[PDB]
Amino acid sequence: NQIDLNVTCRYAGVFHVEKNGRYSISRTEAADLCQAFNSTLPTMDQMKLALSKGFETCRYGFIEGNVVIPRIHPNAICAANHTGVYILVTSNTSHYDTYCFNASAPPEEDCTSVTDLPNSFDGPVTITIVNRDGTRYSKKGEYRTHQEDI
Ligand SMILES: Nc1cccc2c1CNCC2
DSSP states (O other): OEEEEEEOOEETTEEEEEETTSSOBOHHHHHHHHHHTTOBOOOHHHHHHHHHTTOOOSSOEEOSSOEEEEESSOBTTBGGGOOEEEEOOOOSOOOBEEEEEOTTSOSSEEOSOOOOOTTOEEEEEEEEEEETTSOEEEEEEEOOOOGGGO
16 A cells, blocks of 8 residues: 655646656645645746746656646657647546645755655555656655545
8 A cells, every 4th residue: 555756846836747657637635735845836837937036847746737747948748849848738547746836945046855754644555756766755645635636
C-alpha cells in the first residue's frame, strides 16, 4: 500500500508533482495532494511568475481552473513547440499530474530536496517523496479525502 510522489524544484513557490510516475491524479485528488504539502493549486498568475523565474516541465498538470504545461524553451514533443503557460484545450480524459503552490517557499528558484509532507493525515499508506536527485523521504499516512479517489 504505497504511493510515490515525484516532486520538482520550486519556482516562486510553484512545483510539479507526479503520482507513481504516470498521469494519475484527478482534479479532487490534486487539491488534496497540494493540501498535504501545505500548498494550494496555483492561480494562472502564480504560474506565470514561476515560469518567469525558470520553471518549465513537459507534463500536463492541474492549476486552479485549467490544465497546463509551463514552457520556456520550444520543444516539439512538449506542448507542440509552444512557449509560455500552454493551456490544454481539448482532451477526452480527466487524470493528469498537478502543480502546487507553497507561499512559504523562496521567491525564486529553490532546487533543494523536499523532505516532508507536513500536512498528511493519519493513514495506512506508505507515501514516498522522490526528488529528482533520488533523495527519498517516506512516511505512513493518507491525503485523499474523496472516496471516488480512494
Ligand atoms: N521530478 C521528478 C522527481 C523524481 C522522479 C521523476 C521526476 C520527474 N519525472 C520523471 C521522474
